[PDB]
Design a protein around this ligand. Structure first.
Ligand SMILES: [Zn+2]
Lengths: 117, 68
């Protein structure tokens, strides 16, 4: 499902279906428009983890677990430059709401049937 | 350079850490409890709050002050 997360992240990047920022995510949950969510767990935070699934696991919310903050940040491309090597300075992101409108693809039905059960 | 007249510095906004702690109250139950009054203006969304003064609240870029 990692390649499904990769293709839905590149779909969000190519269709502007991403709203990076946890207060933008809180606004998305408050405006009743959240479809897919990505969660970061077992990372370096004393009190942030309790608030992040407290404000994530409300209703009709998918659960994706990421081991490290920086690996999701490198994946989402906060500073995606210099592809002949590595990105220079990317911080670790934790939560993002994928408000994508692109639906007709290959792995979209697969990830929707995986998350429907 | 250093002139004769003094100059007031610009409004350097102090960084406040863990602000997402101070928006909702979390209990054993999963139901949230907002601590700030919500702005009903259509220019801003339903996720925004109001400012926390000591007499009455204050909206965001709407700049609308509501009394009691
Ligand atoms: Zn407003």
């Amino acid at each position: 499902v990692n390649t499904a997360l990769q293709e839905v992240l590149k779909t969000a990047l190519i269709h502007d279906g991403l709203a990076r920022g946890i207060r933008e995510a809180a606004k998305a949950l408050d405006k009743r428009q959240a479809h897919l969510c990505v969660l970061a767990s077992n990372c370096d935070e004393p009190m942030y983890v309790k608030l992040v699934e407290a404000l994530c696991a409300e209703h009709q919310i998918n659960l994706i677990k990421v081991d490290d903050n920086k690996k999701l940040g490198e994946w989402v491309g906060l500073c995606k430059i210099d592809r002949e090597g590595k990105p220079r300075k990317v911080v670790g992101c934790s939560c993002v709401v994928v408000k994508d409108y692109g639906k007709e693809s290959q792995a979209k039905d697969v990830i929707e049937e995986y998350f429907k059960c | 350079k250093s002139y004769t007249t003094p100059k007031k510095n610009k409004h350097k906004r102090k960084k406040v850490k863990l602000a997402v702690l101070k928006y909702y109250k979390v209990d054993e139950n999963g139901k949230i409890s907002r601590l700030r009054r919500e702005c009903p203006s259509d220019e801003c969304g339903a996720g925004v709050f109001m400012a926390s003064h000591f007499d009455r609240h204050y909206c965001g870029k709407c700049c609308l002050t509501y009394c009691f």
